[model samples]
Each structure stands twice: as C-alpha cells, then as structure tokens.
Target: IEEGKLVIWINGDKGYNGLAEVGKKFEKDTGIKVTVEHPDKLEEKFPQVAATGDGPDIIFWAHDRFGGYAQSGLLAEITPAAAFQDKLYPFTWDAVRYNGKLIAYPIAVEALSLIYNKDLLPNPPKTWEEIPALDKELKAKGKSALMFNLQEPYFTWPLIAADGGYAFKYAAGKYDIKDVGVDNAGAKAGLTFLVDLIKNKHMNADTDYSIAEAAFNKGETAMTINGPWAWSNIDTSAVNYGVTVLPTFKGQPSKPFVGVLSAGINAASPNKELAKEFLENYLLTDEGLEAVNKDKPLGAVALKSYEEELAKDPRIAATMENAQKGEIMPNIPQMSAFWYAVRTAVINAASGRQTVDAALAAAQTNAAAEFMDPATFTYQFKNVRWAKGRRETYLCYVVKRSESLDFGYLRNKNGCHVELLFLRYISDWDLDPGRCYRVTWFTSWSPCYDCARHVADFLRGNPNLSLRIFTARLYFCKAEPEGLRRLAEAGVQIAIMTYKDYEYCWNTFVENHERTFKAWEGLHENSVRLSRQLRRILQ
Candidate 1:
C-alpha cells in the first residue's frame, strides 16, 4: 500500500491500446503499478465515482469533460510550468486549464476538415461565397454542394467559428467565463448564413450524420465538413476523397474548435507525488508521447518533437495544421450550458420559426439561468486556373490510375496548371519555334470522324503539339476508325488503355499519392469495350 498503484479510467480500447504498453514500461521503470481500466461507459460512470472522491488516480478523457470535473474539485491542479510550457503547444494549455488552473496534462488534439469527393469537384471552393454557386452547379448534375449533420453542433462549429465565435473569450492570459461569445454578432451571422441555405433548399434539416456521410461517399454530395472520427464508416472504394483545411468565410479563415484528449490526475488520489512525477517527467517526455500514441494516432501530440514524428501521418498532419489555426474548446464550467443553448437557438433560427435575435437571446438567457442548478451538458481546396477560355489542357501527377480513369481528373490540380509550371519544365525553355506540347490525355471515348479529322488537321497545323490519347472505353463508329487510322498514319499514338499501360504510367510518370488505395472488385465494361475497339481500329 505504501508504493501504491496508479489507476486510470479510459474511454475505449482503441485509445487504450495506445497507452497500454507504456503502462508496463512505467511500472517496470518506477516500480509503481499502472492499471488502465475501460468501463463500458466511462463518461457516465467517471463523474459519479469522481464525485464521491473514489475514482481512479487519473482519468483519460476529452477536454470537454474537464470543465465539469474541475468545477466539482475532483481534478488536481498540476501546473505545467518552466520546460513544460515550452514542450507543448500554447493552445494545448487552453483546453486543460479552468479558472487559471491546469486541470489536465494534454496528450493529443482532434479537429475537423473539409472532406470532398475528388471526382465531383476537382477544384473545391476556397470560400463560403463560392459554395452557393458551386451548389447550384453541382445540383445541375444532380449532386449536392454540401451535407452535414444539421443537429450536431460539432459538425457545424467550423461555420460558426468562421466569423470569430467561441464559447468563451480568451483574453489576457485566461478565459473569462462572463465573456461568452456563442450568441454574439459573429455567431449569429454564421448561423444565419446556414439558415439561409436550408431556406433556399440547398440542404435540409433531415440530414443527419448517417445520411450525410452516406451521401458523401456515394458521390451524391460534392463536399461536407467533417473530422477523422467520421472516416471509419466510409467505404473507401466508393470514395476518392481528400482532406483540406476549412476555407475562409466572408474573407475570414474558417477555424473549427480543437478538442484535446488529456490525462488528468484526481485531486484526492493517494499517489499525488508519483502521479505528478510520472506525468511531468515521463508522460510528457518525447519517448513517453511516442509510446502512448503507437497504435492508431488518435490525435496530434502537443509536444513539438512528437508532433514532427506524427506529422508524417497525413491525418495527424492535417489535424495539427487545422489545430494551429483553430479555437480551443474552452475548458470552463460555463461551457456545459453554451452547448445546449446554441443548438436550441440554431435549430429554430435556422428553420425561420424564430427570428435570429429572438432565438439567440432566448436560448442564451434561459440556458444560462437554468445552469445555476447544474444538469445537462451535451453537445455534439484549390486549384485550376488555366484554359485560356478554350483549347488548353490541365495536367497533374495522378494519384491512382484506376480511380482517376473513372470520369475524374487523374490528378487534383497540384501541378501543371500554373503558367510557369509547364514552362519551367519544358525542354529548351521554349527555344523551339511554335509552342510544343507533349500531351498525354486519358478519355473514356475516342474522337468522332469530324473531330478526328480536325485532330489530324490540328496536329498538322500546330506540328509541335503531340498528343498520346489513351482511352479505356471507346464509342467507335465506322467513320471514326477511318479518321483515327488517319491520325495513326499522321504519327499520333491512339491506343486502348491497357492494365500494363496504367502500370507503366503509374510507375513511370504519375506518383501514386493514394495512401490507402482500395481496389474496387469488379470488371469495368470500359475494359471490354476498349479492347474490342482496339482490334477494329484500322482494319
């Protein structure tokens, strides 16, 4: 009993596995036993256990829960000072601090990003103003511009954060509980914009997480703002997606709330000295954070050295990138009411059932007053600027050969679109007379006779622009074959896109940027038609 074992109540096994091995190391090195317990529902159970001062020595939970625990005096204040302050990012402190006390030691951060179908929108919008027009364009093609769980505040907070809204104002080295900005001018404007979208029939209130996520993967929606937490359910084969930071709204950068999952020590723990020493000297060290996040990266580590290692993961990199730009979720007792108040206000205000001002004022005042008794706390791109009006092509290093061939841009406009990009790499630096382009194009269909005839004439006229057209599917007419045969005669390479050709191009020219390429199991009709057309070409 003198040495004592450190006990922690964790949320899930996935996150638990990350720190499991570290526990063995801690016990071996320090001779203090470390036990990690994952109950069925820790959030519900921890608060009650913590109330009676009979909980685990430490609790591993989200920063959002810290406020409630801190207010009840269940959490110990292990102030992260000196070298501790410099090891983690400044914002990590914000998520664990309440009433000028560090309630928890930050481990990692989680945040949201703009997830979009690559094929649906090759060039995603860069601003909120761009979304409406893009929405109309997408709708014309029978797709939606965006879809998200309308009822969940977590999914919608990025929009709310666009115009400088936060649960509490962080001013002059600490968060002021009285300075709640949830119902402020910026929040109202952001929410009002969302309301207008529903009224204009851009999206509906019925859209929940399941529906929105399904639609996004099924290619029914071009884009949706979501986090990595929603990615588990995605059918990778159905989605050729990419992640990017939230765009600027009305000229202001859209920043979502960053949630940190931290390790908090209990105030009444018998092992206070051991807990602090282990936390500050061991858990917060470079080696400690690395061992703790070994499994799947739950979030980016706040420590600078560990962050560099974690950034190698695209997901963690994107999370940290956005976290740097995001607002930390306030760890305050008042945050509980703010969550309930805003959602009530948003639903009615956005539905037009209540005026924005009335809805916000009513919810803010009512929610704040009832909170004195304590109770419910719940809560929840770029590129393409080429094509001189006509007769210009964009090129990029395609990520996946098969996925790119599905009527989608082989590559997101990462390169080859800039004026100087092509120019910089061109041989002889444009010293040759007449603009020369060695263009390789992939299409589902080959050109018609008239188009082919123009292609022949066009090539002869330009003389410098050479095109290697590879089509996986062909719509061939008798006349087109004759024209294509003529194009072949004129030194153009017209060939069926073979699997070998895909491999060759993928290996030789295009970089396989897909980190997790899911092979869709099926034979495409395009493959059959492409082979069939190749035989009948000139004969």
Candidate 2:
C-alpha cells in the first residue's frame, strides 16, 4: 500500500449525490484505501466532528464559516499568502485564513445561475424588461414565462444583487459586523424588484426551482432563474437549453452566492498534520477538483495551480467572471442567524407586509434578537382574477364571463354574467332567459364562463386555486333555469336552451377546430377513439 487508510468527510445528501460520487472516485484513483463519511446534518456535523477530535481527513464548507471556525480556533490554518495578497480579492480568504495560516483548502466555487428552455426562448433576454415581455409572450404562446422560489427569500439574492445590494461588507481584511448593510438603499431597490415581479403577471410563484425545472423541461414554461444544481432536470433533447448570468436591474449584473468549497480541517483531529497533508495533496489535485466541478460550476477559489484547467471550462470561467460581483457567503457562526433572519424578512418584503426600511431593520433585528415569530405575509389576487368570489372584498364578481348568445364572439372585458348560484345579480345578459349554454368547465375555451367551478369559490378562503372542477361538465341547476324563466317570462329577458347535442359537443368542436390535439390520458400516443361514425358526425 502506498499509504495508510484515509477517511474523507463531505457535505450534501443523496439528492445531490456529490459526496458519493467523489468517494467512489477517490478509491479508484489512489491505491491507498479511502472511506467517505457523511452525517445526516452537515453544518452541525462539521463542528461536532471537529470537537470530537475524530473527524475525517478533509471537509468542504463555505467561506463565510471560514472565519467563524478559524477565528474560533476550530479549523486548521492554511497559507495561500502570495495569491491572497496579490491575485485574489483582498477579502476573499479572510474568514478561513487567520494568524498567518491558511485554514482550508479551496476547491470549487458555486453561484446561482439562471436556466431556460431553448424551444420557448431561442435567444435569452438580456434585461428584466425581457422578463415581463417574455411572460406576455408565454401567455400568447401558451406557456409559463418564469418560475422562482416564492417562500424562501434567499432566492432573491441574485435579483437584489442585480440592483447592487450586498448582504455584508468586506473591507480592509475584515467583515463589517456592527455596521450591517441590511437596511441600505440598495437593499430596498432589490426588495422592490421582487415586489414588482410578484405584482405583475410576470412570474408564477407555484413554480419553484424543482417545479420550474420540470415546467421548462416539459415545455410548460420558457425560463427559470435558479441555481446550477437544477441542470439535471432540464430537457436538452428537443429544445435548446441555456444557462447564463442574470441581467442587472438598473445598471449592474446580478450577483449570487459564490459558495467556495474550501477545506475545513478539524483542529481536534489526532492526525491534523496528516489531514492537512491529505488536503494539500489528494483533494487539491486537478483530478479531485475536476470531479467536483464536472456538473455544477463553482467559480474560482484559492485553488492556485489549476488556472489553465479553470480557463478551459466555460462554466468555471463564467463563474470566475461572476466572482467579481458575487459574495463569498460568510464564514461566521452567526451566519445561521443572517440566513434565517433575511429569509424571513425578505419574504415579508415581497408580500408588502411592512415597508422596505422596516423590513430591513426588522430582519437585522431578528438576526440579533431572541427568536420571536419572524415576520409573516400573505399573497392574493386583487385587481384581475380568473375566479372572482372570495371573502377578501366579499367579491361575488367574475372578471371574464360567458353568456348564451356569446357563441359567435362575446367576452366580458369588465365582467361576466352566469346562471349557476342562487345569488341574485339581476343583470341584463338574461336576454335569452333560462338559456344555459353547455359548459366544458375549461375557462377560456368557451365564451360562456369566466372561470370553471373549481376556482369559483372555496370553503372559508384559504386562497389556493383548486384544480378539481377542470374536467367537470355543465348542467343547469333546475332552480337557476326556473328563476331565469320566471324573470324572463315576466319580460325581463332570459331563457334556457334544451340540451340536445351535449354528448358530442366537445368532440364536434375539436374535429372542426382544425388542430392536432393530444388527449389528456393514457401513456399511449392515441389511446381512445370516438368511433368512425361518431368521428364522421363530429367532423
């Protein structure tokens, strides 16, 4: 054997599968034995194992924690002094490096990157103006324009940074802890950008990263701004997929987390020197770093000798370029506070619960204060709605309505009138008294209904659009028909049409529409047929 047994420690879980893949590679490359250990919780385990003096040889963690651990005397110090003082950003390694020693081995750096479907977007837009325009195009082209994490505020980092707002300040080789920059002007601009995005019809909050990736892959959506790890789910076979940096809001390019995977050598390790040596040699090799960077592009770091290799990688190069603007996520133990506090406050800002100034101040306050209920907010459709009736304003209105005589071409630009509930609107579309047109339950397809029954109303207003009524067909509530007849028979103008062609109405409409449509059932391409005679009659 070339050497003694080496046990490696790594972060992440089965979903990411990064540590597993690396563990496999290390064994294959080196004749010496290696075992990869991963605890269920990484952040907790990193410090815990270090405390036990029984942690693995090498570990990967963020640069922000670099200072917290190093300054706290929990991590082994490393020296990339020459590069640190010269080539690297002055504040880059300040966290993990202290007292003239380099504590961690720098590996791959990561940052958030936007991914989009090529079929929907041939050439990606370069500006946020393109975002809403794309959303309109998606509506016209029958697709979703954008998707993002609505619940988590951390997702807004890039968008906020697009307006030049930073989470923390790094100057003169120290992080600004006391003068935290949460409530600054730049931060407000970032929060406002998210607010406008939600207010407009530009993004679908239902589509978070996973859902966004699925939507883009399935051609349901055109674009999604998410982290690089989302690439695995993207569809590249039929459509051209693209990954690029987010556009700036006012005048700056978007900034995201530049997660540097630097080594966190446990100070308590019995084999501290050996662990350092193992980090300096085995994990820091081009082969090792390349293994990690194969899928996700972690920007540049203190990995000094791999300049040519990093140059060869397009993603790595783009990330290095992005690093000029990205924040090296803090290495402070209080980082947990910043992450959670900002997450809570940002969510509140998007919902307009409190002013941006209030939100920023509150977020910083929560970060330092004893944990009380973090800020909370809610979202609802106000101005334009697909389904109208709700307790919010006691709104018993339909934004778009259909009518019996509206068969040829009739749309409720302002609102709709229908004969469904017993509630008395006493409106004028009652011309064809008692005449209830057959409804397909699909909102936009027919000219007679604004929204299908599913989204019309729900129990007590939790405000989630229901999906059950989509397949429901139309039938007149006899009472509604009778009431309309009574009103019309009294010369008020209302009537109901006898149901004759209900069975084949949809089939007939489809055959004559002159379109090739896919059925919503069966794994087979063409599962059920309507029959030759029926098809002929419908055609």
Candidate 3:
C-alpha cells in the first residue's frame, strides 16, 4: 500500500529480532522493504486495530488465535501450493485452520515434555508409579523428584489428560464446544492422581512456575515439565539436563498440548498479494527459516526438510518426538473459558481448598455458563448496625439491566438478616430459566450461619444464579466460619474485600457525590489477616 513497503508486527524481543533478520534478507533479494515492529500486547492490540482496517499487513504469532481471527474475518485465507504443503508436517496445519480453511502458515511446533537432570535421573521414569520411590530417593538427598507450576492449566494438562480428560472433544476438523469433558470420570481420576501426589508429599502444593524453574536450574529438583522455550535459561553448567516424554499415567500416555507458531496475512491489508508472495518466496523457505533459527533455535521445525537438521540437538529431538504424540491446543476462542475454568480447578484441587470432584464439577458449571446468556449484578452495603451496637441489617442492591431500572438502599424491618431479605425480594421477580445471572455481594460483615445456610439453599433451589461475596470484616463466631465454608461448597466465591473493593463500593454505591474514598486505619493489615484466615477456612 505504501509503495513497495510491508509492515509486520510480532511480540517478544527474540521472536521480533529473529524475524527482522529474515526480513532484511527478504529486502536484499527483492526491492520490497520489510519493517518489523516489536509491539507490546500484540494479540490484544492486533484484533482491535485490525477490525478498523489499521493493523499491520502481516502478524507473526502463535496459531491458537487463528480460529478467533478467522471467525472475525481478520485473516486472509492462505492457499499454499500442494508442493509447499507437502514439505511440512501434517499436524502443523491443524493449528492454522478454521473450518477447513488454512488461514496461516505454520513455522514451528512445540510441546511440554519431561526435562530431567541427567546427573540425578539416569533414566526417566516410564510411569507414574515409579515416582514415589524416586521422590523418596531424591528427598533423602534434600532434592525434589519433580516439580512444575501446580496451578497452571498448561503445565498440569498432561496429567489431567493422561486419563482421557480433554478441555473439549475434537472431531471432523472442529471442536465441540458444548461437550466440555473436564468433569468426566477419566478427568476426575487424573485430577485425583495429582492430588495424591501433593498429599503424599511427592510434590509441593505451593510450587509454581518460577519456583519450579529456579529449583530445576539449581538441581534442587530432578525433573520438571517444561518446553523448549525454557532451554536457553536452563543452567547447563550446573545441571546436565536431558529432555524426554512425560511418564504414562495409569497405562495411558501423558499427552501435552502442542502449540504451533505461525505467520498470517491480514485480510484488511491492501497488499495481500505482495504479503503472500513474500511468505511463499522467502519466509517459508529454508534459508529464511534457518536465519531465524540461528538467532533463536526453533523448538521443532514444521518443515520436513529442516526437521532432521534441527533435530540434531537432543532437546529439539525429544520435543519433536513428543510433539508428534501430543494434541494440538484447540484454537477456538471458547478455549478462553476452558483455560480459566481448568486453572481454577487445578488450583483448588492442588491447594486442598476443594476435592477433585467438587473442583472439576464447579469448573464444568462455570465454563458452561459462558455459553449461556449471562447477566451480572452487584450489591454494596455498610453495616451501621454494628457501629450503633444494635442488631439490625441494611442492604444496598444494584441490578445491571440492559435498560435503566430503579434501585435503592433498604434495611430489614424486623429481626430478619439483610441477606435473607434480599433473597426474598428477588424471589418475587420472574427470572429467565435460559439465562445465568451472576450476583456479587459486598457487605461490611459476613453473613451469620443462618443467613449462609439460607443463601446456600436458595442457590441450590435456583440453579440459574451464582453468587460471589466479598466481606469487609468476617464475622468472628464459631458457627459463622462453617457457614462461609458451606457457602463455598455450594458454589459461592467468598473473599475478604481489599482496599480497591472498598474504593469500588464508595465510587459505585455511596452517595458521596465527587468525594474520594480513603482507606481506614489498619485496613491493609486487617485485609491481609482476614485473607489468610479465609484461605485457611477454605482449605
């Protein structure tokens, strides 16, 4: 569009710099000038700008976003020559396609595999049963046998999928978004296996990405689940590491999600033809790919011609072999909900906050709600009754409606708690059975045992509504904490309201007009203390 110039946007320094080298070579061969920009948050920004026809001519990113972009009509369909298609691995195309239309060019594929310290683990365990003994042997020497991000869905997925668990069922070139299998029997077994590991002390419940990485680098852990992207940061001098496939789970192989990095032409670009020419002529070629790989070695080259050469590195070879056995991460935008749900399930189960069954069941419900018509409502209240040394309750409610609706503050007339009164008030309204309503309550004091049971029973009767409660001060009664636990068990998310939440309440619900909300004395310390107490109760 701008003479013979083409613009491309990519995120990350290594990726952008690597592609920039190839772009320079492209410019040398052809008169077309290639400008590569390293932009922050490219994934989020590209969609926004491209929708208005102001995005780059090309985008270099992972293929998981292909489905969303394709559905949005933001990517140009790429029809590579059969000869060119034949040169890449067949599975790589699965990641770049949406409804059988190839909209992007795959460059490399990567998957998480078992990365072990050769000095500690001479031979990697072939099955999970061997881990307990290995863990004991390592612990005797003050080291862990294995560790990874306990709460990360991506890292924990192999274990979850080992027993046939899947985020969604895939068949016939499409994923069935409706058939979420996170709570299936096999998935429960997989999650139980992970919980057993934590319970048995073979793995730490608190281990996260940074902790696992640092421990592995220092040889404090014998093995970890990581991808090739982490190889450069691994301290090879201090720890001699080797990569291999994950151990089998209950006779089933641990299958990790495979991700493909790719390049796509923007549908809104005026120079689509030129972009395609550049991709086929230079970007996908062996020379161009090799130059980029030299800068930052590709984990697993998608091109068949370059595979053997890159596979010479043992780490690359292991990841390539593992990638062949893994499933492509579902590229649909619905996966966003799946990821969030799975992460929550993993964290809850790992941290002993909930049983595997409860966590998985909650995840299934939460994810399914995203596919349904959902409405959000917020309630904020301050307990003046406690300050006045009286037993009374006040409630301020706000229902978010598509059209304007009147809302106001109210107080309980008799001995009734505000929570029950609010429930009784909403019970009169004719609610939609097909819609899911998420209601959030912000109260100065948490509900008493009676109110918690009433609210929990109310939720059980009305399956369409979900509740989240944020309390400024947790009521310190013996039965009240049990009530909070019961509320959580009944699918209510309860937390200690932080300063920002207080600010939100002041700005949204208070009749303070333009006045700013200020933190009260000991607010931060009390919040932290209450948060820890809440965590203990939840666990």
Whole-model lDDT values for every prediction: 0.67, 0.51, 0.78
Cα deviation at 351, candidate 1, in Å, is: 2.1
lDDT (10s digit) by residue, model 1, range 215-306: 88877988988887777656454578777777787788777888888889888788877888777777777777777667665667878888
TM-score-best of 1 and 3? 3
Segments of candidate 3 deviating more than 4 angstroms: 1-3, 369-539
Estimate the TM-score for candidate 1: 0.64
lDDT of 2 by residue, 1-539 (tens): 11256566666532124444555664566544556666676766666666656666566666665665676577765554463344334445554554455777665556666666666777877776677767887788777777777667556777766665666566645554444666667777877777777777566433365666566677787776665565554534365676766666676787777767666766765556655545555556665556655644455555656645675755455556666567767654445556656776776676677667777887665443221111100011111222233221111111112311111112223334332321222121221223322222221111122222212332112222111111111123224333323322333221111122222223222223333333233212111121222223222
Question: Candidate 3's residue-wise lDDT over 248-273, tens digit each?
Answer: 88888887999998889889888888
Enumerate residue pairs that collide in model 1. Answer: none
TM-score of 3: 0.69
Better of 1 and 2 by TM-score: 1
Cα TM-score per model: 0.64, 0.58, 0.69
Candidates, ranked, lDDT: 3, 1, 2
Question: On TM-score, who's better, 2 or 3?
Answer: 3
RMSD of each: 25.2, 22.2, 14.5
Best by TM-score: 3
Q: How good is model 2 by TM-score?
A: 0.58
Error of 2 at 316 (Å): 4.5
